[PDB]
């Protein structure tokens, strides 16, 4: 009996509703103000998920908040890619049961090319045959995939933590196979998939940052925590002070 997977599966967040009035015409301001609200709500869930992760309260308290606040985009995109694959066979974007994106909403949001990228990512889940155990490990692993170039308050704890999640992923892959190249292939595949979440998250950091700057001119609302994170933390990523941790060089 695997204690690590039990935990990952126990703490997985439920459904989060976007609060969207689907009875509105699909306007830009309204799709975007709703996505923002989805962001702010999902944040609360990510925090409590992250805090109930194995080894996590180990990290220094400020590092705990830092790594949540750099990594959120990556996490939410990956999950949403999954929700999309499990429900709507990847065909649309399952932001929340009350906020699914069709083509038309992908154009109206004005972030059409990002949505296409998110859709693709979503499809990889099918193409690779990602099991729910792989999904869960990879997603938790994503929490420790982006950090300040000049390290964290307790970087050693962090590096140990991350190493452990990597080895746990290797475990979920390997406790079921036989032939030799099989487990190499697969691990290569997942490290590549995990890597590819980063340029997408980066496109979306740019996007939302831009939006926030021009939100008064455009009637898009940003909730308190989303405002703050996007103006304090995202800029550290955009300017290159915080950076992802790739497995492979691009
Ligand atoms: C809530 C809780 C309880 C016990 C914990 O023990 C730490 C275990 N741990 C760790 S160790 C974190 C490294 O930092 C430390 C902290 C204290 C002493 C030595 C190293 N990495 C893990 C990866 C997967 C699963 C568990 C992992 C962590 C959180
Ligand atoms: C950041 C953002 C609001 C929050 C969105 C984000 C797109 C990706 C995303 C996926 C989710 O499943 C929840 C909300 C988030 C995190 C949106 C892109 C522009 C908008 O400002």
UniProtKB/Swiss-Prot annotation:
Record domain NR LBD: where: 1-230
Binding sites annotated in the UniProt record for 17beta-hydroxy-5alpha-androstan-3-one: 36, 83, 208
Subcellular location: Nucleus; Cytoplasm
Annotated region described as Interaction with KAT7, given as residue ranges: 1-249
Cross-link (Glycyl lysine isopeptide (Lys-Gly) (interchain with G-Cter in ubiquitin)): 176, 178
Consequence the record notes for mutating residue 74 to V: In PAIS and AIS
Entry comment on modification after translation: Ubiquitinated. Deubiquitinated by USP26. 'Lys-6' and 'Lys-27'-linked polyubiquitination by RNF6 modulates AR transcriptional activity and specificity. Phosphorylated in prostate cancer cells in response to several growth factors including EGF. Phosphorylation is induced by c-Src kinase (CSK). Phosphorylation by TNK2 enhances the DNA-binding and transcriptional activity and may be responsible for androgen-independent progression of prostate cancer.
Note: In the absence of ligand, steroid hormone receptors are thought to be weakly associated with nuclear components; hormone binding greatly increases receptor affinity. The hormone-receptor complex appears to recognize discrete DNA sequences upstream of transcriptional start sites.
Protein name according to UniProt: Androgen receptor
Organism: Homo sapiens (Human)
Originating gene: AR
